């Protein structure tokens, strides 16, 4: 009955929703995250603060695409927007 | 907005509620997570099915709690739950 808990049941929804693209349905391919990412959310790509963080993770995933992630890489990739955001104060702002 | 995104704000409900104990705000000693997890969830620890996982992560937080970690690394460690509980079907079920 935590908050957070709902919180993993949402990255299931768009994760299994695209899923089994990779042959595995617990898994993805690291293009396919990249390409359900801005299908849905097309927001906290413009709250990245990190331009070194996300500039790294995005030629990354340029280069690795066509490679295999799972659930807990995906949540990974998603907070990496969220510490490019938030964690983002670790500097003088 | 995608209910994807609303997820990582639950977890800084939870992280950023009790952060500051080591040092910053946006940083936290691995045994203060291990501690809110299970004072805030009470349920997703019965949902872990992998004993492979929980047995080597669990004695890993039980030796490394005096160590730091921030909010991405909260995030890897609520979706070591999810692993054990969904990839679970990599095997006989």
Same mark, same amino acid.
């Given at each position: 009955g935590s908050e957070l808990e709902t919180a993993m049941e949402?990255?299931?929804?768009?994760f299994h929703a695209h899923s089994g693209k990779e042959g595995d349905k617990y898994k993805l391919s690291?293009? &396919? @995250?990249?390409?359900? #990412?801005?299908? &849905? @959310?097309?927001?906290? #790509?413009?709250?990245q603060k990190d331009v070194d963080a996300?500039?790294?993770v995005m030629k990354e995933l340029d280069e690795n695409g066509?490679?295999?992630v799972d659930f807990q890489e995906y949540v990974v990739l998603v907070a990496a927007l969220?510490?490019?955001?938030?964690?983002?104060?670790?500097?003088?702002?």
């Open positions: 949402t990255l299931i929804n768009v690291k293009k &396919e @995250l990249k390409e359900l #990412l801005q299908t &849905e @959310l097309s927001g906290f #790509l413009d709250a996300v500039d790294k066509d490679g295999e969220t510490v490019a955001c938030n964690n983002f104060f670790w500097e003088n702002s």
